[PDB]
Amino acid sequence: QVQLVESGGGLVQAGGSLRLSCAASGFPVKRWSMTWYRQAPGKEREWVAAIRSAGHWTHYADSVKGRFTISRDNAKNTVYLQMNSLKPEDTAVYYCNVKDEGDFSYWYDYWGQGTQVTVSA
Amino acid sequence: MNIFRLTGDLSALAAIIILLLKIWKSRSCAGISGKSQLLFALVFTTRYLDLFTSFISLYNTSMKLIYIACSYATVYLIYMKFKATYDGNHDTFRVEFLIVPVGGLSFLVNHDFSPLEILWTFSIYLESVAILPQLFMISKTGEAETITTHYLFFLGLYRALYLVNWIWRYYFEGFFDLIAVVAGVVQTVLYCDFFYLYVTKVLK
Ligand SMILES: CCCCCCCC/C=C\CCCCCCCC(=O)OC[C@H](O)CO
């Protein structure tokens, strides 16, 4: 019913920057949230940054504050994650997750396939 | 997480059905604030207005319909069917002093200035104070013959599961809605005073 596609990953040096994109396809809902996750090799997945469908609210994990910036683009059904000053610890497969914030919409929960991000030391 | 929001919503629906069923089978709405039930009917009407526009699921349309039908039926039983047992002389809270400040607050403090967002913010703020007429009535008479212990349990389970939901989504997903949380805390404290009054005044 809803497809999410992530892009923008690859290999980059330490201190570089990268921008990922989560393009959404399917049938929209009026109120949603989008969250970026990442899963380094052997560790549990952890949320990174979060944004809603409208408003100025953003949220960044302690480890990425000041370095990551999350932004919206509804005219294209896409949400961006700008990654500046990358450290080798940021190496992971990054996933975006979109959730319906409306009531009685418990099973409207979609994830991308993931995009690899590797940061060389 | 979506286990807590689902069981929380179902626990809210259970409370509505319990109150509605209690009034029908006892043929009395003694001790019930018709003003609070009117405010709750107004919460569900404004929150689920996109009933009659966007279709998402059969569970989605029916749950929106179940809440509306049950709240309106409770209002119908109190003010029309069993109006003889309605203690109008004790349900004296002037709800304009709730709706008007809640309406103004929704236009001032919200996440985004749009009709659908203002309407949602209205229903969030109103629900947090919708029980106030019920509190002032029990505080006034010390009785709530129609309020059952199980009714209060499902109201309390609804608030507890929502509290868990806020904590789970914040820690595991980084999501937090300051407006919904702040209004949700006001609502939960108000329900706790509801429970404290029932235990001390009605449960003599
Ligand atoms: C009657 C029930 C109690 C309702 C009590 C409201 C609780 C706080 C909600 C949102 C403020 C958080 C900021 C998010 C929205 C932006 C608002 C803003 O920038 O300024 C308004 C200021 O926060 C005004 O206190």
Q: Pick from A35, A100, A106 the residue to mutate for testing the B interface (most B CBs within 10 Å).
A: A106
Distance of CA A72 to the CA centre of its chain: 11
Distance of alpha carbon A25 from alpha carbon B95, whole angstroms: 45
CA distance B66 to B72: 10
**Which residues of chain A are within 8 Å of residue B47 when distances are taken between CB atoms?**
103
Q: What is the rounded CA–CA span in Å between residue A43 and residue B19?
A: 49
Min Cα distance B116 → chain A (Å) is 8
Q: Which helix (H) or strand (E) holds A83?
A: strand A78-83
- Which atom belonging to ligand 1 lies closest to the Cα atom of A57? 14
Documented resolution in Å:
2.3
**B63 interfacial to chain A (CB closer than 8 Å):** yes
Report the candidate in B12, B14, B123, B9 with the shortest Cα–Cα distance to residue A106: B9
What is the DSSP secondary-structure string of B109-140? S-SS-SHHHHHHHHHHHHHHHTTHHHHHHHHH
The residues with which A59 forms a beta bridge, in sequence order, are A50
Q: Does B158 touch chain A (CB under 8 A)?
A: no
Tokens of A88: 């080798």
The residue to which tokens 């569970």 are assigned: B59
Give me the phi and psi of A79, to 5 degrees please.
-125, 140
Q: What is the domain partition of chain A in residue ranges?
A: 2-119
CA distance A37 to A66: 17
Method: X-ray
Fold of A2-119: Immunoglobulin-like (2.60.40)
* Closest by Cβ to B175, choosing from A29, A50, A108: A50
Q: Looking at this protein, which amino acid is placed at residue B12?
A: A
